[PDB]
């Protein structure tokens, strides 16, 4: 009492006292809300008005908290803020507010009678502020605020910091919280009606702003400038102002980097190795400088007057490139709260998906040949932008035909539907339907393809699809307008599948695809670091607006003319449901019809382009069924942006030949497109590259896209992941720790806690101070998730608490006579966060019996089975070897509660919930097999692969689970997660033995295995310092990432191990190429029993190209060998540092005598490379000499 005065707050170490003390405090926060309100609104807190300190770069700032009067005094709700059309078929055309208006909650009511136009609208706004606002990654939103504010108390050891007064000023009204969310109704509920309607979203704003303070992007002073900017945006519409201002306040850095003038940056080479630093000027080209003038008058208006002076402060003071990226990262968290944006679906539907024509119209191709309906068949452009793209793409048409013939498309279409189910196909229309339990699988793709089987080959199947409106789904994303996506029916999607298969064939023929492949390491952006380092370059990252609304009906035909010529040469008889037959056909210049042979796909490509209706219907609770106007790009029939990627690269490379006829040699290097995002690289003189740069800006305007052309000499953007002079800059705000779209909140823990590790490791190089994230996400795991919501039966409810109370405390509800179930809430010790297949969260130093603390883990520590080593390290491995004992030291582990941490892990709670559902919910037998036995009849017969799969099992070795044979998959396709139904009484019916193992627990022990001796290696610091590799000399100033600033431990880790391998990352990318876990499960075959690898091919049914990748992927991979002692390092968790453990062998020494004669020399490097990453905090230039446990070597030879 309280968290800023704890012994853990001052030493930042666990002990037998402070760790048992910090458990009592955080468990008290998550358990009872009355303690939470006293924590957040405590009287001892002092209010702050004027404040002063240092900014992000050490310059002194003075800011003052200012809360606008319009939140303390919300205006009464105004009916005119959401006008309607006179017919009241929809919202009025022009309208200001797509999102919430700020108003007092008690001013919104509906006196109108039910089933009236105005009654349904007020019911929608009541559905708005009370439903859409709550989006929380964990538990209640108040517990999420506690974990952030609790982290700020422990980190600064002070109750007095500016961010707290924003909480005490806004949310302190009455004795209780202004509002609480009830999980039962999935609604926020207001206890005080005078509160402003927008306030609940601001709890997510402080949770984001409090993350940046722990992160080190924002300091206490810059936090004040940020919070006022959001409260200024709360009038009059909190999200409309953010979406309007966000473009201007992030773009200023161009002019500020112009004033830095000279700067020294590392120069990357082609191979992703740093070859040196270079002193380059950062002056922008003259035409870039003239665009600064238009921004200044615009930044003086829309921006907040105090936040505007902050950017004027940045353009002045900063003198080095590191200072600019620090001011830029600071502006990033002031312009975005990181929350998912949300509205009523039809309010945002207007401007998001409504088609819009801009600049010139697109004109038709000439029709060389036509169907008897006068549908197009093959066509060509006389002139226009469509002729420009065809001058390029026409040379690829013939080669694609040789590859389309090889694929057996019916085998592909059945495999294409398997990759993503359920597809939310329209539900069963009428009686019976037979059925009858297929309605339980009614929302699926493969199930709907199986039910409609005889229907597959009928041509009539396609015309039945044309009567079905295309339902509109909305997928929200951070800091962006709400997106309108279009789901499609099986046959409706099937019409576009043939054009898609031609569309992805081009990727092998070019380097123009940014979507080609991605590894997730620094090699992903690796080419960008090369071009940013070069002399005489004009970089250009052209984002394109719209693309959903920017493709008019006539624009799509540019892509059709490419597919129609490819489908013309392709010979693919009986694609189904179609024939390779003759046809009566009209030609240009001939009077009467001619007789031309036609293959199957050329019909299916023609029929799809002939009928096109992109209108997306949506059924709403207000206006009935609303239908968006035609002219959208559906996003997406079959697949996209494979439509856009062939469309953009043909518009760009074809412009190069358009300049060839004009006689101007076209300076250019390489060009990546995802799409729709484009990126270009122009090398040449400053005058010539601008002339070619203007042409690419104009040709896209001529084809109907409007874009914001960006040009710079020293910076570039791609995938919203930008690079400057070979210096990666992260985006902190894009990761939203505290919100999610699904509102999927459930008490299952390995689902949530292991997911949180994916986020904290994705913030490793997007943050300046990683050490603060560890204290942040610990308290998030120490508070937001300490309870378990399992439903108990009234019979067994009294038997459980009689034993488990000895270790882990839990909640005891009085038995309820009314209903059968009596709930329990299972609190867990903090120790569960650190155990294997627990949280696996990085740990603070512990206290041994000797008093020496264990090593302080960093963000780079691997997870998986390696986390179990922390158990032995508490027992002092250096003492364990001198006594030659493998004893586990169970007594000390009972103190911290590891003994109880493993009791929850022995329940296998997430494994029983799956097994209990598989019994009854899936009938299998005749119900499921009849569809799988039928579904096999469409595939090119046959996959008997289970006979080729179990051939690997006996004997043979076990393999698991699904790499092939998806006719066991439709069983899994019914998850029945919502809800758990009545089967939970049978889920705990098998747990009657699991409370019979707690009476059988008696004195509990932690199990050990003979394979567990591997943990007993521990290193002892030596004396001689390590000579350092040259990369540190180049990166020592103007550092390439926020946490790699000079002298920071994240920089020093790259200095010791070095960068990622060349051939290793290109090769490991290929095992993920076939996938679109198979690598490791099949790798034990390559090491122990190699002859099973050949049948490993035919059990997966991999092709000859896929067979040679897995053989070639074991070549450069086996240099660091197999894991008998496995570890998990995410490629996102690393980024620049070397992945191959061999790199760490240089900085550690081993005695020769420890090696086995011809075996396992390469295993000690995993013992070393995994250890240096675990503790870079205490590492300071020391060569290491490992010692081995005497019983470890006896195990290795056995």
């Amino acid at each position: 009492t309280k968290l800023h005065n704890t012994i853990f707050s001052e030493t930042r170490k666990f002990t037998r006292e402070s760790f048992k003390e910090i458990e009592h405090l955080t468990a008290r926060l998550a358990n009872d809300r009355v303690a939470r309100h006293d924590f957040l609104f405590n009287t001892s807190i002092v209010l702050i008005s004027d404040y002063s300190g240092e900014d992000s770069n050490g310059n002194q700032l003075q800011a003052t908290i200012t809360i606008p009067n319009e939140i303390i005094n919300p205006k009464e709700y105004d009916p005119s803020d959401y006008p309607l059309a006179e017919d009241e078929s929809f919202f009025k055309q022009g309208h200001k507010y797509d999102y919430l208006v700020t108003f007092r909650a008690g001013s919104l009511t509906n006196t109108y009678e039910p089933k009236t136009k105005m009654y349904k609208l007020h019911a929608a706004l009541d559905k708005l502020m009370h439903v859409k606002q709550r989006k929380s990654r964990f538990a209640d939103l108040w517990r999420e605020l506690c974990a952030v504010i609790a982290s700020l108390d422990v980190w600064y050891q002070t109750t007095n910091y500016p961010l707290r007064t924003y909480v005490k000023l806004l949310f302190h009204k009455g004795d209780e919280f202004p509002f609480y969310e009830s999980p039962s109704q999935d609604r926020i509920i207001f206890n005080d009606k005078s509160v402003a309607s927008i306030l609940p979203t601001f709890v997510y704003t402080c949770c984001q702003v409090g993350t940046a303070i722990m992160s080190g992007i924002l300091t206490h002073v810059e936090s004040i400038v940020a919070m006022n900017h959001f409260l200024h945006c709360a009038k009059d519409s909190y999200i409309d102002e953010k979406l309007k201002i966000k473009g201007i306040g992030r773009s200023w850095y161009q002019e500020a980097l112009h004033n830095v003038c000279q700067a020294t940056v590392p120069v990357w080479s082609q191979f992703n190795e740093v070859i040196g630093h270079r002193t380059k000027s950062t002056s922008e080209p003259h035409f870039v400088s003239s665009t600064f003038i238009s921004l200044r008058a615009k930044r003086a208006e829309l921006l907040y007057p105090e936040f505007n002076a902050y950017i004027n402060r940045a353009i002045q003071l900063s003198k080095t490139q590191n200072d600019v990226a620090n001011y830029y990262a600071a502006c990033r968290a002031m312009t975005n709260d990181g929350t998912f944006l949300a509205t009523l679906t039809e309010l945002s539907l207007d401007a998001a998906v409504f088609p819009r024509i801009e600049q010139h119209l697109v004109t038709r191709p000439a029709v060389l040949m036509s169907n008897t309906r006068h549908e197009s068949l093959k066509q060509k452009y006389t002139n226009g932008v469509g002729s420009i793209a065809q001058s390029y793409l026409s040379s690829f048409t013939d080669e694609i035909a040789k590859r389309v013939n090889g694929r057996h498309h019916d085998e592909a279409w059945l495999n294409f539907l398997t990759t993503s189910s359920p597809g939310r196909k329209l539900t069963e229309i009428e009686k019976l339907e037979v059925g009858g339990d297929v309605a339980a699988w009614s929302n699926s793709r493969i199930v709907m393809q199986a039910v409609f089987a005889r229907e597959y080959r009928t041509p009539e199947r396609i015309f039945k699809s044309l009567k079905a409106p295309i339902k509109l789904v909305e997928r929200q994303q951070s800091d962006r307008r709400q997106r309108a996506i279009s789901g499609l029916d099986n046959d409706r999607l099937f019409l576009s599948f043939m054009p898609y298969t031609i569309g992805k064939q081009i990727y092998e023929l070019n380097d123009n695809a940014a979507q080609g492949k991605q590894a997730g390491n620094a090699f992903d952006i690796g080419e960008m670091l090369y071009w940013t380092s070069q002399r005489n370059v004009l970089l250009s990252s052209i984002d394109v607006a719209g693309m959903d609304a920017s493709v008019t009906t006539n624009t799509k035909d540019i892509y059709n003319t490419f597919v129609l010529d490819v489908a013309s040469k392709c010979t693919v008889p009986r694609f189904g449901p179609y024939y390779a037959k003759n046809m009566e056909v009209f030609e240009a210049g001939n009077r009467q019809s001619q007789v031309r042979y036609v293959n199957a796909a050329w019909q299916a490509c023609a029929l799809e382009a002939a009928n096109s209706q992109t209108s997306t219907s949506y059924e709403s609770e207000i206006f009935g069924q609303v239908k968006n106007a035609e002219g959208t790009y559906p996003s997406g029939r079959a697949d996209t942006s494979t439509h856009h990627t062939v469309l953009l690269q043909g518009l760009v490379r074809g412009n190069e030949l358009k300049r060839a006829s004009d006689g101007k040699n076209s300076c250019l290097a390489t060009i990546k497109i995802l799409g729709d995002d484009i990126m270009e690289i122009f090398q040449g003189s400053e005058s010539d590259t601008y002339d070619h740069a203007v042409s690419n800006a104009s040709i896209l305007n001529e084809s109907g896209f409007a874009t914001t052309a960006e040009l710079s000499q020293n910076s570039i953007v791609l995938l919203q992941q930008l690079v400057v002079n070979g210096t990666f800059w992260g985006f902190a705000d894009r990761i939203s720790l505290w919100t999610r779209e699904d509102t999927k909140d459930i008490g299952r823990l390995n689902l949530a806690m292991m997911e949180l590790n994916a986020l904290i490791d994705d913030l490793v190089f997007r943050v300046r101070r990683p050490e603060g994230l560890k204290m942040l996400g610990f308290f998030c795991g120490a508070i937001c998730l300490r309870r378990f919501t399992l439903s108990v039966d009234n019979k067994l409810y009294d038997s459980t608490y009689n034993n488990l109370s000895k270790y882990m405390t839990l909640t005891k509800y009085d038995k309820n006579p009314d209903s059968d179930s009596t709930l329990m809430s299972l609190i867990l010790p903090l120790a569960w966060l650190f155990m294997p297949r627990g949280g696996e969260y990085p740990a603070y130093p512990f206290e041994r019996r000797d008093g020496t603390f264990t090593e302080d883990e960093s963000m780079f520590t691997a997870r998986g089975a390696y986390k179990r080593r922390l158990l032995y390290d508490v027992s002092n491995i250096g003492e364990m070897i001198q006594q030659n004992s493998m004893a586990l030291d169970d007594d000390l582990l009972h103190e911290y509660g590891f003994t109880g941490a493993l009791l929850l892990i022995d329940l296998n709670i997430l494994d029983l919930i799956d097994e209990v559902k598989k019994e009854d919910i899936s009938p299998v037998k005749v119900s499921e097999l009849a569809t799988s036995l039928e579904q096999l009849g469409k595939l090119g017969e046959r996959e008997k692969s289970r006979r080729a799969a179990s051939d690997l099992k006996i004997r043979g070795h076990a393999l698991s689970n699904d790499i092939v044979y998806g006719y066991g998959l439709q069983e899994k396709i019914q998850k029945s997660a919502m809800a758990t139904k009545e089967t939970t009484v049978q889920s705990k019916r098998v747990s009657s033995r699991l409370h019979d193992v707690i009476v059988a627990k008696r004195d509990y022990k932690i199990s050990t295995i003979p394979a567990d001796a591997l943990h007993l290696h521990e290193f002892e610091v030596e004396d001689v310092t390590v000579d350092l590799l040259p990369h540190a000399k180049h990166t020592s100033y103007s550092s390439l990432a926020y946490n790699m600033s000079f002298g920071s431990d994240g920089w020093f880790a790259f200095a010791l191990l070095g960068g990622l391998d060349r051939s290793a990352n290109l090769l490991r990318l290929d095992v993920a190429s076939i996938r679109g876990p198979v690598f490791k499960q099949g790798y034990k075959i390559y090491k122990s029993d190699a002859t099973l690898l050949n049948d490993f091919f035919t059990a997966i049914s991999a092709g000859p190209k896929e067979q040679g990748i897995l053989l070639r992927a074991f070549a450069y991979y086996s240099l660091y060998g197999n894991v008998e002692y496995h570890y998990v390092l995410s490629p996102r968790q690393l980024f620049f540092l070397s992945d191959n453990p061999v790199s760490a062998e240089r900085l550690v020494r081993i005695p020769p005598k420890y090696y086995v004669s011809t075996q396992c020399r390469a295993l000690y490097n995993i013992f070393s490379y995994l250890h240096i990453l675990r503790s870079i905090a205490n590492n300071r230039g020391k060569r290491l000499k490992m010692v081995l446990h005497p019983g470890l070597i006896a195990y290795v030879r056995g």
Partner: peptide
Amino acid sequence: PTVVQSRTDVFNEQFA
């Protein structure tokens, strides 16, 4: 010595 100071000192000597 703080760890950073030791790290910086080590860096300077090698690269003088």
